[PDB]
Each structure stands twice: as structure tokens, then as C-alpha cells.
Amino acid sequence: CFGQCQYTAEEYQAIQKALRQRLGPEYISSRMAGGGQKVCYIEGHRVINLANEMFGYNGWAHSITQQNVDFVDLNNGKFYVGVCAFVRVQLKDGSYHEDVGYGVSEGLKSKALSLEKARKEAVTDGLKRALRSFGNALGNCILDKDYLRSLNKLPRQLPLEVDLTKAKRQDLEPSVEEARYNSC
Amino acid sequence: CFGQCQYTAEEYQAIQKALRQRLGPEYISSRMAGGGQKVCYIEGHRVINLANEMFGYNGWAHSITQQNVDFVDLNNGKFYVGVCAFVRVQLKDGSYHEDVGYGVSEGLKSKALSLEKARKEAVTDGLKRALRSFGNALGNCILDKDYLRSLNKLPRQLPLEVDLTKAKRQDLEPSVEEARYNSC
Amino acid sequence: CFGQCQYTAEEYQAIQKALRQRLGPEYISSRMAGGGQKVCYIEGHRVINLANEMFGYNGWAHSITQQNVDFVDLNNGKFYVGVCAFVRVQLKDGSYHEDVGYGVSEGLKSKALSLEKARKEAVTDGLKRALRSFGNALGNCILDKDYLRSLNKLPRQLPLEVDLTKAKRQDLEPSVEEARYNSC
Amino acid sequence: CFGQCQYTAEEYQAIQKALRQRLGPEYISSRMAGGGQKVCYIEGHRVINLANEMFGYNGWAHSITQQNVDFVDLNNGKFYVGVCAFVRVQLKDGSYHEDVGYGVSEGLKSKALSLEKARKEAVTDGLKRALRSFGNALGNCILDKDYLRSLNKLPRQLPLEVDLTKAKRQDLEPSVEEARYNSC
Amino acid sequence: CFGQCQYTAEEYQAIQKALRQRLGPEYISSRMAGGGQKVCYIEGHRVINLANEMFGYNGWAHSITQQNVDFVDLNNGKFYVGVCAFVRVQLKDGSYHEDVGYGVSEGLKSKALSLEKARKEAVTDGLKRALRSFGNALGNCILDKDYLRSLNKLPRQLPLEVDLTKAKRQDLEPSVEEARYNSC
Amino acid sequence: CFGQCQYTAEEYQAIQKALRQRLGPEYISSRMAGGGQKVCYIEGHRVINLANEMFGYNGWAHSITQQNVDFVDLNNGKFYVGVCAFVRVQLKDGSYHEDVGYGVSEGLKSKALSLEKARKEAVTDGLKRALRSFGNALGNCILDKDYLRSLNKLPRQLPLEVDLTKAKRQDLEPSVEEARYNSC
Amino acid sequence: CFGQCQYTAEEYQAIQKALRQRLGPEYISSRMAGGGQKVCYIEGHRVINLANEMFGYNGWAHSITQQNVDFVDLNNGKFYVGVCAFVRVQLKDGSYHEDVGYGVSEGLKSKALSLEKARKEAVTDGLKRALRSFGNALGNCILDKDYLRSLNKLPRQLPLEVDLTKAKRQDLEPSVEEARYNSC
Amino acid sequence: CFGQCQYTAEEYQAIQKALRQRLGPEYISSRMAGGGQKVCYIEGHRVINLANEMFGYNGWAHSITQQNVDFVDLNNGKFYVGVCAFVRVQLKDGSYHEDVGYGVSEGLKSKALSLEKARKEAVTDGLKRALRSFGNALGNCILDKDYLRSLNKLPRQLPLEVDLTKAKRQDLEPSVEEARYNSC
Amino acid sequence: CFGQCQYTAEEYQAIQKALRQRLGPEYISSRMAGGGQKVCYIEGHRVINLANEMFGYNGWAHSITQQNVDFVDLNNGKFYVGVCAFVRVQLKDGSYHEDVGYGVSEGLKSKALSLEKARKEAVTDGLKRALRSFGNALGNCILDKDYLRSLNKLPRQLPLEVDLTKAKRQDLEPSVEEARYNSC
Amino acid sequence: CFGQCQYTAEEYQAIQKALRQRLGPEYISSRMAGGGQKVCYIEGHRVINLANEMFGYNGWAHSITQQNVDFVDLNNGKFYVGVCAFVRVQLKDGSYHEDVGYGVSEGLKSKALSLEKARKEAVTDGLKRALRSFGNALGNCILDKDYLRSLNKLPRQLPLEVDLTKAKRQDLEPSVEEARYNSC
Amino acid sequence: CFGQCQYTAEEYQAIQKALRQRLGPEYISSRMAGGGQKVCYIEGHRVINLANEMFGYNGWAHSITQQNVDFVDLNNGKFYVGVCAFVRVQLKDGSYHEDVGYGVSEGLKSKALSLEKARKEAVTDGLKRALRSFGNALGNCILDKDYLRSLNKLPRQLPLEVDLTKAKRQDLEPSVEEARYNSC
């Protein structure tokens, strides 16, 4: 089952070589840090799809080992919420990587929305930081300074328009059900 | 049993390819956020059916690892309830994904109804966010900005009328019972 | 034993296809919500029989993982009781689904009756919401808005009179005892 | 041992078909609810015998997972006692069903008798509600409204006189001891 | 060992048929309830011998899962003691039944004697109520109203005088020791 | 080892038949209850020897599952000590019986002696009550009223003088050591 | 290993027959009870040697399951210490017996010596009372009243002088070391 | 799986020889310590890539065994946060190394950002210090004084510009998916 | 390994016969008890060597199951320290013996030295009392009164001078290393 | 895996002989103790490399079993921090050694830096003291007084300049990757 | 692995005979006890090397089962620290010995240094006292009074000068690495 299967040599080399390279300009987005320069990051769904495409959708898993609210402060009617989360990512071979993410809320008035934002963000950057440890292709290169400098010297590409003419419009999946029938 | 069976190659490719694409305009609904623009989301039962159709009704499971009431506040006779829930979704191969959902209640007067809404919603978006990690087909594409922009440029389709002439009107299931007899 | 047997292909397809469709007008009942429109729901015993008929009487199980009284308030001599319950439903293959139900009591004067109602209702809607996740046939369709709209356009069928001429009037079960003898 | 043996096909169909039907007029008794109409129920020993006859005396078990006194109140010299009990019923195949029962005492003066009544009744309706989930024959039909309406249109049968000429008057069991000798 | 051996078909039918019938007039005794009619019950040793004779002396076991003193009150120099006990009875096949018994003391002056009576009685009716669930022969019929009415219409038999000419007067057991020698 | 060996048919019948009968006049002794009639009981060592002779010295075991001091009260310089003990007796086949005994001290001045008496007596009647459940021969018949009435109509036998000419006067056991040598 | 080996038939009969008889006048010693008659007992080392000679030095074990100081009181400069100890004795076949011993100190001035005496005595009579349960030869007969009466009618034998000409004067054990060499 | 596979001789010698040497001038960076000289260190991603390249991306894992906030102090409106983290690095053969890292924040005003920095840095230097123990190539040489002195005598190389013409611009990985297909 | 090997017959008889006899005058030393006569005891190292010589250096083990300081009192500048220790001695066959030792300090001024003495002595007499249970040769005979009386009638032997010409003066052990080489 | 492999005879003798000798003048460094003479010690990385070279990089592991801050004192604006750490070093054969190290900080003003220094130093000398127990080659000889005296009589060798022309300048490891490919 | 291998006969006799003798004058050192005579002891590293040479470097292990600070007192500016440590030494056959050591500090001013000394010394004499139990060669003879008296009558040998011409001056171990290669 999970955490027991042994990677084959061809699969090992494929995944290692694929993880060796860096990301392209489409993945990295930017934010305006408070009292700082432009901070480059990667969207959560981009890294998620990268994971399901590199290790397989059934090849990697992530769990929240422990999450606790660090603080909820009420200052002049605003809620400052800080939350930490421990996220562990495990492959199908048994390897794993555990890292901490932080969720921060400072502007919202409603306490419930503040905790919602804080906990969801804590989990999402926990996942990001835990997947970063597996190689450059999953998001390590964002921390490299020379890589960011080279990125700054690239043309600003326009966002791609999604061609959805072949999207999912009917529920029944004849191919998937047929394959599962052949597997049963 | 569950969490032990190994996915076959044909089934693996079928589910991976099916999870690769995005959702169609029928799945995404909209809400009017308080002091915000239109927020797009997916209904819970849509994602549930997507799960039972992609992995099989017996292929995926979800459990509530931990749920705790964050706060219940009484302000001038109204109840503000905020609840967090940890939901873990596991496939039949052993892979899993754990995520946090939040339930919020702010308008209801009765405390019992407020907690009912908060806990049920916390579990439902916990399930949604935990299933989002498995691919674009299960709801990841809702977070993509370009995908939403493309969706905004689509015609507004009328809701489909359900043809229920072949609904379930008798309890006895001759086909299911016969198949189970042949299996016993 | 339970949670270990593997579903056969024929049984898998039978149960999947049976779970794919929706329910008929006989199952859904209605309630008059306080300060609201007609709220449609499904009776507990209907869903129970649906479970024993779809998965077999020995094919599904449910347990109360955790139940705790959220609040018991005494307001001007009335008891407001709110209770939450965690219910886990497991099939014979190992798959499972866990969900939360709420029990509410607001009118009864006696505390004991209020807790009785609250806990029993909490468990019953916990079972309902946990069985809802297995497909449309077990009660998912109640949440679909288009399905409810189509239901509203149906004739109001009169309740069926139960023909009990073949009810259980003697204790001794010659068929069951004979079959168990042949099995021993 | 218990919870490990697999049901045979013939036994499975026998028990399923036997559980499919409903109960006869002899089983259901009535009570006069406080400020209400006639409430129909089933006696505990009737359901107990139904269990030992349907699944075998060694085929089903029940345990009290957790019982706690909800409240003991002293009002003007009377004791109001409310108790909850969690009862789990398990078959010899491993299937199980867990449900909550409530015991209520409001008239008795002595505290000890009040707790005796409350706890015993809590366990007995816990057993009833946990056995109800296995099918219509074990007591599910009591909750069906149309079934009760049909029952109201039946003649009121006189209670049966027990013919005890073949009761147990001697301790020694030659048949049972001989069978156990042949089994040893 | 215990809880692992499988009952044979002949033994199963013997014990089931023996448990099917009811008890004779010798077993049931009567008590004068405080402010009530005659309450019929069964002596503890009668049920104990019934157990060792029906399932074998090595075929059934009972344990006290949990016992706690509910209350010890001192009223004007008298001790009111109420105790609850959870008793679990298990057969050699693994089946089990768990039930609650209550011990009550209200007249004794000495606290130690009151607790002695309360705890011993709690355990004894715990055993009685736990053995009641196995069938009519072990004491279920005491709760049947028609059975009690039929019992009231029976002649009052005089208590039997025990013929003890073949009692145990010497310690050494040549038969038992010889059989154990042949078994070793 | 202990709790695993299976009783043979001949041994089973020997022990069952031996346990079926009642005790002789030598075993039962009498005490003068405070403000009561003559209370009949059995000495601890008598029951102990009965156990080692019926099941073998290596065939039965007893353990103290839990013992707690119920109360130690100081009244006008006297110590009233009440102690409860849970004793579990297990055979070599795995069967067991658990029961509660009480130790009482009310006259002694020294606290240490009072607790000594209370705890030792609690354990000894715990053992007695736990062994009572195995049959009439081990002490069940003491609770039978007709048996006691028949005992009252018996001649009062003089206590037997022990013939100790063949007592144990030398430590070395040539027979036991030789048998153990042959077993090694 | 320990608690797993099965006793052979010859060894079983040897140990049973040896345990059947009673002790000789040399073993029982006497004490002058405070405000009482002569109390007969057995020395600890006598019972210890009896154990190592009956079951073998490697055939029996004893452990202190739980020991707690009941009370340490300071009265006018004297220390009254009462201690209880739970001692479990286990044979090599798996059988066991657990019993409570009490240690008492009332005259000593130093607290440390009082606890030393109390705990050591508690353990020693715990061992005595736990070994008493295995038969008459290990010390059960001390509780028999007729046995003590017969003992009182015996001549008072002078204590035996130990002939130590063959005592242990050199450390090296050629026989034991040679046997262990042959065993290795 | 992980922690079970045995390293081969050729792989063992390869990794040992590779770990024997020291790092080149590109890896070590410098910081200006407060009131101190230039402090040399290694970037986190450099060591991460070194780990995935030396032991394989699936050959090493790291987990956070325990992390606790040492202190959060508020001094004149600034937050001094000190956090410790225990990080354990394990190879695929079972070997492991556990070490402590510290995260420090002293300048930031917002508490949430201070804890974010402190915890993330604590984990990152925990990983660094835990990987340092495996050899000189993974970062041990930074602590050698003579190595640092030799480094100071080296020319200051300009940072390398990353050639990203072959970066990751499309999601689909034909090579990885094909290899996984061949492995399934 | 330890606690699993079975003693051979020759080894069993050798150790049993060796343990049967008593100790010689060299082992027993004397102390002047406070306000008492001469108290005879055995030195710790003597008993230790006796253990390693009787059961082998690898044949017996001892562990401190639990040690707790009973009291540390400060009286007029002196420290009275009383400590208890539970010591368990286990043979290589699985047999064991557990006993309590006490450490006492009353004269020392420094607290640290007092606890040092108390704990070390508690452990040493715990070991002595736990080894006493294995037979007369390991120190049981010290408690025999007739043995001590016979010892008093013996000539007072002068202490033996140790001939150390063949002591250990070089570290390297050619014999031990050669034997271990032959064993590897 | 780790802690299971058995050392071979040749490897055992190699490691034993290598551990037998002492260290050379290059390893030992000196410190100026406060109010003391020159204190000789060994650098952490030296001992680390000695470990990876003697037992192999995959042959030894170390873990922090428990670390707790002993004290953090604020004296006139300075922070005195004392920390203890328990470090366990285990070989691949299962052998282990556990020892305590202490971290001390007394001069630093910032609390965070003080704890950083204290905990890191505590772990590093815990590792040193735990590795010292394996032989003279890993650092035992530092405690020998005659060895230190002989060291003082040696010429003061100049520190060696590291020849880094063959350092690690490229990430890709063709040899390691090729060996791992051949191992997969 | 460790604690499982069985000692061979030749190895057993070698180690037993080697442990039988006593130590030579080089091992024992002396200290000037406060207000006492010369106290003889053994250095820690001497006993450590004795252990690795007698049982092998991989043949014995030691662990700190539990260590707790007994007291830290501040008297007029000096720190009196007393610490106890439980040390367990285990051989490769499974045998073990557990003993307590004490660390004392009374002169140092700094608290951190006092705890450092106390804990390190506690562990070191815990190791010494735990290794003492294995025989005379590992340090038992230090407690023998006649052995010490004989030692006092020996000439005072000058400390040996260490010949370090063959010390460890290069890291690479060709012999050890070659042997490990042959073992892999």
C-alpha cells in the first residue's frame, strides 16, 4: 500500500531528473510586501498540480500533524490572529518531509473570518514549505537569489487564457468506469 | 481491504487523465460576499458525486480527525459562532490529504441553530478543501484566476431540469440483491 | 470479517449503478421551518432501510465516535438543549464516512425529555448526513436545488397503505433456523 | 470466534428475507403519553427473543460502551433523574450498530430507586434503538407512520395464554449435556 | 481457549432449544414491594446453576467491568447507599452481554454493612440482568406479563426437601483426580 | 500455559459432576450476627482446599484486580474501617469469575490493626464470593434456604481430630525432586 | 521460559500429593499477642525454603505489584506506621496467586527505622499469605483450628542444632561450573 | 520501504567518498554579525539540494520531533521571540541524526511576523545542523577554522547567472508519466 | 536471549544442590546496633560474587523498578533521610524475585552526602533482600536463629590476606579477545 | 535495517583495533579556563568525522532523548542560562551509549542568543561525551592525565593548510548517481 | 542484534575467568576525603576501557533510565547541588544491571557549572556502580577491605609515560574501510 512500494530505477531517474531543473516564469507570482520590495512566491494550486504530476495523484500525501492557534489579540476592535501548522508530506516509498507554516490575519473585523484565513493560510504555506524540500522543481528555486535576479531580467508574459472546450460537463466517466471494471 | 489495494496501471492513467482537466460551467455557483465582488464556489453534493464517480463509491473515504469550537460570543443578543474542523480524505491505495474547514454563524438568534450551521459548514468545507488537493477535476480550478476570468466570459446557462421518470420508487433491488447472491 | 472482504466486480457495478440514480417522490417528506419556507427531508427509517437494502443488512455499520452536550440553558423556565454527535458509517470493504449531526430542543419543560430528544435527534441526523456521502440514492439529492424544483412540480401522492397480512405473528423462524443449521 | 465468522449465502439470504418484513399486531404495545396521544412501542423481551431467534443466541452481542448520569435534581422533595447510555450491538460477522438510550425518573421519592429505574431503562431503550437499525423485523416498523395507521385499523387481539405444561421443572439437561459430551 | 472455541451444530441446537422454553414454578420467588403488589423474581443461585448447567461450568464467565458508588447519604443517623455495577457475561464462543445492576441499602445503621449489602446486591442483579439476555430459560420470562398471570393461576408448591445422603463429606476426589491423571 | 489448555471430555464431566452436588455438614460453620440469628458460612481454608482439589493446585488462580479503602472514620477514639476488594478467579481453560468482597473493622483501637483486618477479610470474602460462582460444591449451597433448613435438622458432629503422624517433618522431598528430575 | 512450561503428569502428582499434607511441629513458632493468647505462625525463611524445595528454586517467583504507605502518624513523639503491600506469586506453568500483607510499626522512635520495619514486614507477610493459597504444606494449616489444637497437645521439641561442617567456605563451585560448561 | 533498504557496497563507497571532501567557494555566504566579524554560513536551499543529490530525493527525510516557543517578550513595543526546534534527519537505511535549531526575531513590530520568522528559521537551522553530522560535504567544513582561513585567501567569485532556457514551462511530463506507466 | 533460555537438568541439579547448603564463617560480618546486641549481616560484594559464581556473570540481572525518597527532615541542623527502593532480580530462565530495601542517614550534615548514602544503601540492601529469596547459599541463613547460635560457638577466624601476585596489571586480554575472535 | 545488522569478525577486529589507540596532537585543542590552567578538549567536527570514518557515515546515529532548560536567570541585565541535554548514540548493531551534556551562557545580553548558545553547546558536548564511551580513539584519552602530560611534552605543530583544489564545485555527482542506478 | 545474541561456551569461560581476578595497583587512585582518611577509587576512563576490552566495544551498552535534580540550595552565595542518576548497563546477551550514582557540587559560585559538575559526576559514578556488579575485574575489589589493606602494603609505582609514536594522526583508516568493504 502507501509508504511500502519501492520506486523502480527508471521511475527514480525520471523523477530525479525532472526535480533537478527549475521553474519557468509562469509559475512565480509577486506580492507587494508591507514596507518592502516585491516578494516572489508560487500559488498553492500550481504546486499542488506539480505534486500530482511529478509523483502521481496517488503517489504523494500530506497530513496536518499538529495545528495550534498562537494568538488571538483584540486591538481597538481589530483582530490580530497568528496560527502555526505542522504539515508532513509523504511519498509512496515512505520518504517524508515535515515543515511549519504560518497563517496571519490583521485587517478583518469578524473573528470567525480572521481564524478562517489564518488557519487556511497556515495549512497552505505548510504544504508549500513541506513540498519545497523535495527539489528545485517543486518550488525550491524561489529562495535562490541569483534565480530571482535572472527572473527579473525576463519579459513579463501575459497570463494564459484557458481553453475549456474540453472541460468536464457530464458526470458519467465511461473511460474511468470501464478501466475500473477491467481492474475488478 | 481499504488502504491496501494497489491501483492498476490502466486505472491509474484513467483517473490521472480524468483529474487533469478542469470543471465545466455547470458546477461553479456564485455568492455575494459581504462588501465584496462575486465569489465563485462549488456545491458540496457536486464534489461528493465527483468523488464517488472518480474514485468509486467504495474508493474514497473521509473522516473528521478533530473538531473544536473556536468561539461562541454573545453580542447584544446575537450569537457569533466560529468552528474549525480537520478533515482527512483517504483513497483505497493509502494516499490521503488532510485540510481544515471553517464554519461561521453570525445572524441566527438561537444558539443551537448557530452551532448546527457552524459545525455542518465546517465539515462541508473541510471535505471540499481536502478533496481539492487531488487534482483540478475535483475543484482545484476554482482558485485559478485565469480560469475564473475565462468563466466570466461564458454564457449564463439555465439550470437543468432533472428527468426523474426513472427515479427510485420501490425498495426491493432485484439487480443488487441478485449480484450480491452471486457474490456469496 | 467486517472491513476486510473485497467487493466483487459485479457487486461493485450493481451498487454503483443503483447509487447513481435519485430518489422518488415517496421518500421525501416536508416540514414547516420556523420563519421559513417548506424544508424537504427524508425520514430516518427510510434511509435505514435503503442502507440495509443497498449494502445488505450485514454490509454496513455505524458508530458514535464522540457525542458531547454543547449547551443546556434555562431561560424563564424553558430548557434550550443543543447537542452534537459524530457518526461514522463503515462498509464491509473498509470504506467509511464520518459526519456531524445536531440535536435541538427548545419547547419541552422537563430537562430529561429535552436531552432525550436532543441526543436521539443528534444521532439520527448524524446517521443521515454520514450516509448521504455514499451517493444520490441514499439521500444526496435532497440538497440539489434543481431536483427539489422538479419535485415541487410533481403530483402529491397519497400515502401508501401497508398490506400486513403477511406480517410476523409467530416467533419461530423455520426457514432461518433451517438455513443456519445447514450453515453449521 | 465472535466477530470473525463469515455468513454463508443461504444464511445471509434467510436472515435478510426474514428481516425484510414487518411485525405483527402481537408485538406492539401502547402507552398513554403525558399530554399526548397513544404512543406505540415494543416490549424489551420481545425484541430480545427476536434477536436470539433471528441471529441465534450466540450470534449477537450487546455492550454498554459508555453511560453517564446527565442530571439528578431535587425539586421540592422529588428526584428528577436523567441518564444517557451508549449501547453497541455486534453480530458474529463483525457488523455493529451503536445508539443512545435515555432513562427518565420523575415520580419516585427515593433516590436509589430513581437511579435504578433511570439506568435500567436507559440501557433497555439503548438496546432497542441499537437493534432497530438491523431491519424492519427487529422493530424498525414502529417508526413508520403508515404502518401505525394500518395497525390502528386492526382488531384488538386478546393476549395469549402461555401453555407451560412443558416448562423447565428439573435442572439436569440430558440432551444438552449429551450434545456437549459428543462435542468434547 | 476461552472466547475462541466454535460451538458445534448439535450443541448449538441443544442449547438453543433448551433456552427457548420458560421456567417452572419452582424457580420464581416473591417479595413484598414497598407500597406495591407482589413482585416476582428469581434467586441468584438458581440462575447461577442454570448457567453452569446450560453452558457448562467452564462455558460461561462474568466480570465486573466497572462499579462506582452512586451516593452515600446520612439522614438523621441512617445510611442511604446506592451503588451501580456493570457486569459483562461472555460465552466460550466469544458472544457477550453487558448490563447494569443496582444495590440499595436504606435501613442499616452501620455504614460498612450498608456498603456491603449495596455492592453485593448490585453485582448479583447485574449478573441476573446480564444473563437474562441469553434467552427465556435463564430468566427472561420473569418480565412477561402473561407468563406471570399464568403463574398466579398455579398451585403453590411446597419447597422441596434436599436429600443430602450423597453430599460431599470427604475431600479426596478419586474420580476427578483419576480423570485429570488420564488427561495428563 | 495457563488460560490456554483445553479441558478434556472425561475431565470436564468429572469436574462438572463433582461440582453438581452440595457440601456436607463438616464444611459449614456458624457465627452470631449482631442483632440477628445464626449466620452460616464456610471457612476460607476449606474453600481453598476445595479449589486445589477440584481444579488442581495448578488449575485455578486468583488475582486482586482492584482494592480501595472505602472509609476510615474516627469516632470517639474507635476506628471504623470499610474496604472493598475486586477478586478475579481464572481457570486453566480461560474461564473466569470476578466478584467483590468487603472487609469491616469496628472494635479495634489501633488503626494499623483495623486496616490489616479489613483488607485481609475483604480479600478472603472476595475469594469466597468469586469461587461461589463455579458450582454448588465450592460454596454456592450456603445461600440456599432449603439447604440450610435441612442442615439445621442434622446432628451436631464433633470436630475431627487431625492425625498428624505423617506430617511434614523433613525438608528434603525425595519423591518430588525425583519426579522433577525425570521431568527434566 | 517462565510461565510457559507445562507440568508433567508425574511432577504434577508429586507436587499435589506433597502439598496435600500438613506441616510438622518444627515449622510453627509462637508469639505473645498484645492482650491475647499465643498466636502461632511460620517463619519467613521456612516458607521460602519450602517454596524452593516444592516448586524448585527456578519454579516459583514473587513480585510486589503495588505498595503504598497507608499512614504515618506522630503521637507524642512516637511513630505509628501502617503499610500495605500487594504480592503476586507465579509458578512456571503460569498459575498465580495475589494477596495483601500489612507492616506495622508502633514503638520505634526513628521514622526511618519505622518505615524500614513496616515495609519489610508488609512484603514478608504478603509473600506468606500469597504462598498460603497453594496448599496445606506451604502454610495453610496454620489457620485450621483443629490442627492448632492437635499441635498444642504435642511435646515441645528442642530447637535443632545446625551441623555446618559442610558449609560453604570456598567461593569456586567446581560442580556448578562444570555442569554449566556441559550445558554450554 | 523507508528505513529498511540496505545500502550496497558500491553505493556506500560512492556516498562515503563524496561526503569525505569539502565544499567549494560558491556554497558559503557571509553575514555581518552584530558587534562581530564576518560570519560564514551556507544557504538552506544549497544544503537541501546537496541532500537530494547525495542521498537521492527519496533517500533522506526530515521531521520536526518537537518545537516549543521559548519566549515571547514585549519590550517598549517591540517583540523579542525565541523559538527552539528539534529536527531529526533519517536515511533510507535507518541511520538518523537529531539536532536543535533556534529561531530569533528582535526587530519586527507585528507579533505574527515575528513568530513566522522565528519558527521558520528555527526549522531551517535545525535542518542545517542535523544534516551537518553526515559529513564534510553537507556543511561540516563551515565550522573548521583552517578551512575558513583558506577560504578567506580565495578570490571573490561573481554570482553565477542561471541559464533557464530549459526551465519548466509545461505541466505535462511525458518522460515521468511514461516511466511510471512502465513501472505499473 | 535473557529470560528465555531453559536450564538443563544437570545445571538445575548443580545449582539447586549448591543453593541448598549454608554459608561459612568467612561471609558473615557483624555490626553494633544502636541500643542492641551484635547484628550479623553479609557484605554486599560477597553476595554479588556469590551471584555471579552461582548463576554465572551473565545468568542473573537486577533492576531498580521504583525508588522514591520517603522523607528528608531537618532537625536542629542535622538531616534525617529515609529512602525506599524496589529491586527485582531475574535469572536467565525467566524466574524473578522482587524485594524492598531501605537506606537511612541520620548523622551527616551535608544533604547531598545524606541522600548519597541513603540511596546507595537502599539499593544495596534491596539487592541483598531480593537475592536472599533464591536459597540458603545466597544469604538466607543469616535469618535463621539456630544457625546464628551455632555461628557464635565458632572460633573467630582472622581475615584472609589477598594474594594479588596474579592481579590485572595489563589491559590487553589475549585469551578473552582470542575466544571472542573464535566466537565471531 | 539500522540496529539489526550483525558486525562481521573482520570488521569487528578492524574497528576494535582502530579504537584501541589514542589520538594525535592535531586533534586536541586548548582553552583558557576561568581562574584555571589550560583545559584540553577536542573540536566537535573532529569527533564527528572520526565517527563517520570509524563506524561509517551510515553506521552510527545520535538522538536527543530529552532536553530541558535548567535555569534562565536575569542578573543586573545579563542572562545566565544553563541547559542540560541527554544524547544517545547508537551503532548499526544495536549497541548504544547515552550521556548528558551541559550548555552554559553567561556574557550575552540578548536572551535569544543566550539560549541558542546554551542549547547548541549542550547538544554538542552531549554528543562528545556519548561518543567518548566507545573507545580511546573517539576522544577518551582526553581524560587521561598521563596522556595529557605526554602531550604537553610535544612540539606545538602549526595548523595544516587545507588543499581545496579538489573541493565540491559542481552539484551533479556522476559517480554517486551511477552507483545508485546500478543499485536500483 | 543487541540483547539477542547468545554467548558461546569458550567466550563465556574466557569472560568469566577474566572477571574472576582482581585489579592491579595501576588502576586504583586515591582521594583525600573531607575529615577522613584516604579513599581509594577507580578512574572513569579506566573502567570504560575495561568494559570495552572485556565485553567488546560493541558488547556492552549503558543508558540513563532516569535522572532528577535532588536539590539546588543557595547558601550565602554558594550553590549546593545534589543530583541522582539511574544508570542501566546491558550486555549483548540481554543481561543487565541498574544502579544509582550521585553528583555533588558545593564550592562553585556559578549555578551552571555546579549543575554541570553534579550531573556529569552523577552519570559517571552511576556507570561505575552499575559496572561494578559484573565481577571483581571491573571494579568490585575496591570495596573489599582486605584487598585495600594488601594494596596499602604495595610499593607506590610511578605513573606510566604514554608512548604515542603510533597515535592517530591521519583521518583515513585504510584497514577499517577495507574490512567494511569486505563486509559489504
Author numbering:
A (entry chain D), B (entry chain E), C (entry chain F), D (entry chain G), E (entry chain H), F (entry chain I), ...: 25 to 208
What did the study's authors say about this model?
The human RAD52 protein, which forms an oligomeric ring structure, is involved in DNA double‐strand break repair. The N‐terminal half of RAD52 is primarily responsible for self‐oligomerisation and DNA binding.
However, only low‐resolution structures have been reported for the full‐length protein, and thus the structural role of the C‐terminal half in self‐oligomerisation has remained elusive. In this study, we determined the solution structure of the human RAD52 protein by cryo‐electron microscopy (cryo‐EM), at an average resolution of 3.5 Å. The structure revealed an undecameric ring that is nearly identical to the crystal structures of the N‐terminal half. The cryo‐EM map for the C‐terminal half was poorly defined, indicating that the region is intrinsically disordered. The present cryo‐EM structure provides important insights into the mechanistic roles played by the N‐terminal and C‐terminal halves of RAD52 during DNA double‐strand break repair.
